[PDB]
Structure formats: structure tokens, C-alpha cells
Amino acid sequence: AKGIAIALLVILVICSLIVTSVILLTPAEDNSLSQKKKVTVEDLFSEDFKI
Amino acid sequence: DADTDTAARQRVWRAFENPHTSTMALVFYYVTGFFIAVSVIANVVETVPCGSSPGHIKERYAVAFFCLDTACVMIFTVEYLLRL
């Protein structure tokens, strides 16, 4: 009974770990690009903004 | 009074369809019930906006759930195949 419960614990931890590995490997991208840089006072006074 | 009486590779079938006979049959029974439960819970928590809706278009929408069903489905198949 309780040893059978230990068997449940073992099989469930095995399946949980393998599916956790699956969900760690599937998101190949797992990344995105956000918005660009806004304009501040330093940007106006940055050398790059010189004409 | 005389309906049924408890009486090989087919032998585990009696263990399989009477899971309260052997430890392996009982553990497989309980774990496949847990798999059914986790699959339906995966479906319902897929339907919730926090999981599979554009709650934050600015940024979550996990497509990992697309795996959770399939594996579970395959798992179920084997016991069905077992009964085959």
C-alpha cells in the first residue's frame, strides 16, 4: 500500500522530470526583442547626434 | 452466488483489470488516473487568460502545453494497446 505509494512517487517524479526537460527543450526561441531607445538630453548632447 | 471466481502474459490481464491484486497494476492504475487528471487540468489552465491569451501583448503565452496533452495521449494509448 504505502510502498505502492512510494512506487507512485518514483514514477511521478520520473515523468515530471522528463516532461520538465521536454518543456525546457521545446522553447527554442525563448527570447524576444523589446522597443528601441528613446531620446533624452544626453542623446542630444551625445557626440553621435552632432551634425 | 456463482457469478465469478479469480482464475502467463495474459495473466497480468487479470492483474490489470483487477488492479488491487499486484503492486505494479495498482501503481499503473493510479498513475494513469493522475495522468488523466493532469491532462484535464492542463486543458483548463490552458483556457485561462493568464496561460494562453494575449494578456500582455507587450511581453506568458506558453506553447509548452502543446506537449503536455500529446505525451499524456501517448501514455493512454499504451494501456489501450495493452488491452489490445
Curated annotation (Swiss-Prot), chain A:
Indicate the transmembrane segments per the record. Answer: 4-24
Q: How does it assemble?
A: Homodimer (in vitro). Interacts with KCND2. Identified in a complex with KCND2 and KCNIP2. Forms an octameric complex composed of four DPP6 subunits bound to the KCND2 tetramer. Interacts with KCND3; this interaction modulates the channel gating kinetics namely channel activation and inactivation kinetics and rate of recovery from inactivation.
Disease with which this protein is associated in UniProt: Familial paroxysmal ventricular fibrillation 2: A cardiac arrhythmia marked by fibrillary contractions of the ventricular muscle due to rapid repetitive excitation of myocardial fibers without coordinated contraction of the ventricle and by absence of atrial activity. Intellectual developmental disorder, autosomal dominant 33: A disorder characterized by significantly below average general intellectual functioning associated with impairments in adaptive behavior and manifested during the developmental period. MRD33 patients manifest microcephaly in addition to intellectual disability.
Q: Which family does it belong to?
A: Belongs to the peptidase S9B family.
Tell me which species this is from: Homo sapiens (Human)
Question: What else is on record for this protein?
Answer: Genetic variation in DPP6 may influence susceptibility to amyotrophic lateral sclerosis (ALS). ALS is a severely disabling and lethal disorder caused by progressive degeneration of motor neurons in the brain, spinal cord and brainstem.
Q: Which tissues is this protein detected in according to the database?
A: Expressed predominantly in brain.
* Portion of the full sequence shown: 94 to 143 of 865
How is the polypeptide modified once translated? N-glycosylated.
Name the job this protein performs: Promotes cell surface expression of the potassium channel KCND2. Modulates the activity and gating characteristics of the potassium channel KCND2. Has no dipeptidyl aminopeptidase activity.
Protein name, as recorded: A-type potassium channel modulatory protein DPP6
Where does it reside? Cell membrane
Curated annotation (Swiss-Prot), chain B:
PTM details?
Answer: Phosphorylated by MAPK in response to signaling via the metabotropic glutamate receptor GRM5.
> Which residue positions does the secretion signal occupy?
none
Q: In which tissues is it expressed?
A: Detected in ovary, in corpus luteum and in granulosa and theca cells in the follicle (at protein level). Highly expressed throughout the brain. Detected in amygdala, caudate nucleus, cerebellum, hippocampus, substantia nigra and thalamus. Expression is not detectable or very low in heart, kidney, liver, lung, pancreas and skeletal muscle. Not detectable in human heart atrium.
Q: Which residues lie on this side of the membrane: Extracellular?
A: 48-62
Spans through the membrane: 26-47, 63-84
Subunit note = Homotetramer or heterotetramer with KCND1 or KCND3. Associates with the regulatory subunits KCNIP2, KCNIP3 and KCNIP4. Interacts with the regulatory subunit KCNIP1; this interaction mediates the capture of both the N- and C-terminus of KCND2, preventing N-type inactivation and stabilizing the S6 conformation, thereby accelerating closed state inactivation and recovery. In vivo, probably exists as heteromeric complex containing variable proportions of KCND1, KCND2, KCND3, KCNIP1, KCNIP2, KCNIP3, KCNIP4, DPP6 and DPP10.
Q: What does this protein do?
A: Voltage-gated potassium channel that mediates transmembrane potassium transport in excitable membranes, primarily in the brain. Mediates the major part of the dendritic A-type current I(SA) in brain neurons. This current is activated at membrane potentials that are below the threshold for action potentials.
Tell me the protein family, please: Belongs to the potassium channel family. D (Shal) (TC 1.A.1.2) subfamily. Kv4.2/KCND2 sub-subfamily.
A further note on this protein reads: The transient neuronal A-type potassium current called I(SA) is triggered at membrane potentials that are below the threshold for action potentials. It inactivates rapidly and recovers rapidly from inactivation. It regulates the firing of action potentials and plays a role in synaptic integration and plasticity. Potassium channels containing KCND2 account for about 80% of the neuronal A-type potassium current. In contrast, the potassium channel responsible for the cardiac I(to) current differs between species; it is mediated by KCND2 in rodents. Is specifically and reversibly inhibited by the scorpion toxin Ts8 (AC P69940).
The protein in question is named: A-type voltage-gated potassium channel KCND2
Species name: Homo sapiens
